[PDB]
Subunit: 56 residues, 4 copies
Amino acid sequence: LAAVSVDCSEYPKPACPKDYRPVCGSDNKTYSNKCNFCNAVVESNGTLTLNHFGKC
Amino acid sequence: LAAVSVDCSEYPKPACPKDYRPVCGSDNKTYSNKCNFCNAVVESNGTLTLNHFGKC
Amino acid sequence: LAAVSVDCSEYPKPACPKDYRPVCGSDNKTYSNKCNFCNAVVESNGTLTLNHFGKC
Amino acid sequence: LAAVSVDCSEYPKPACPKDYRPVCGSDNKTYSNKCNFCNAVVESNGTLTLNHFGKC
């Protein structure tokens, strides 16, 4: 199986970059970057995942 | 799941290297490197993913 | 496919850090960090995978 | 979707480390490490993938 992926291991991080590189989460919300996405993933305890890269 | 993946989480980027090290997209197009591929994935909003590494 | 993943390709390792930054395995056990988790995945021969990031 | 993954982007590499960190390929062969696995993946043009980490 081949995928396109995000590694959220280094997260959470108390501060994130202000770089806009959007990720669409499975909550159908668009996270401004990987760092916001991943902070949210880890805190979601299982319930938030990746839908696709880019704006929803 | 165990997968073979490309990490596109730091994309898009302002420019890519000219380095040849192809990736075959799910569109059966060969992308000259990972960077060119991931810049395309993040614009495809969901529709482009990895097919395999190396030229199609 | 778009996934959320942990890269375990450089595992097993001789030792892991004591750093707390939990990962929940598909066995519903919480692994104190990515390194402890991946050392377990590579011994599980197929049966253990990621459930989610953070504590179970 | 949550996975455990390998990134084979930096490959092929003409030489590999002699570190023994086995990967089982979907050809049901066991590759001595990530570098041997990935060299083989890229040359396989699509036909070789990950089965699981560790010896087959």
